[PDB]
């Protein structure tokens, strides 16, 4: 039982939760849920969505 990270929203992914996505160059994308899987299909940038991990990582939130 391995726990992976959602590559868009950063959440941990427990078994049987979410979907996986294999793009044309075969790079694999995992998603915690339909929300982050829908924002990925809209071409939204992860680093400008305020609640994602990579967002807070650039804005330097909570690492203090």
């Amino acid at each position: 039982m391995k726990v992976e990270i959602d590559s868009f929203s950063g959440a941990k992914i427990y078994p049987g939760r979410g979907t996986l996505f294999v793009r044309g160059d075969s790079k694999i994308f995992r998603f915690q849920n339909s929300k982050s899987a829908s924002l990925f299909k809209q071409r939204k940038n992860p680093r400008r969505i305020a609640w994602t991990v990579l967002f807070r990582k650039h804005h330097k939130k909570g690492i203090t």
Partner: protein, 136 residues
């Protein structure tokens, strides 16, 4: 199944009814395939036979070298884009439908396959695994 199928396959979600048109991912020279039937399918009034990843079908070449056209030949589904469920728990799907072109015994008319290949395909058809790059 029948000729060429090694072992059994675990049912996955059917993504390609009769009439579907998928990319043909091999280098054999066909640009796309047109599924006219699915090998081994069941018979119920009004259903359309429906393919899935790793299946063997009957296809024709709409776009591609005219040598290959106007003739029905068997084909194999290497990609789906209708998300199915593995038993390790994941749902996954590819970016689009795709397939390769084969003989009733399962050998490959082409020498390569581009982009990913589902590992429900790669295990069930030993020649497809030998031609594959990325396997999922």
């Amino acid at each position: 199944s029948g000729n060429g199928a090694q072992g059994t396959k675990f049912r996955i979600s059917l993504g390609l009814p009769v009439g579907a048109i998928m990319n043909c991912a091999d280098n054999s020279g066909a640009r796309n395939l047109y599924i006219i039937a699915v090998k081994g399918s069941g018979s119920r009034l009004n259903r359309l036979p429906a393919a899935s990843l790793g299946d063997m079908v009957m296809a024709t070449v709409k776009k591609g070298k005219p040598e290959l056209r106007k003739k029905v030949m068997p084909a194999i589904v290497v990609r789906q884009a209708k998300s199915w469920r593995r038993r390790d728990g994941v749902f996954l799907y590819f970016e689009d439908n795709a397939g390769v072109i084969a003989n009733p015994k399962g050998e490959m008319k082409g020498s390569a396959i581009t982009g990913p290949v589902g590992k429900e395909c790669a295990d069930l058809w030993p020649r497809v695994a030998s031609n594959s790059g990325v396997v999922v």
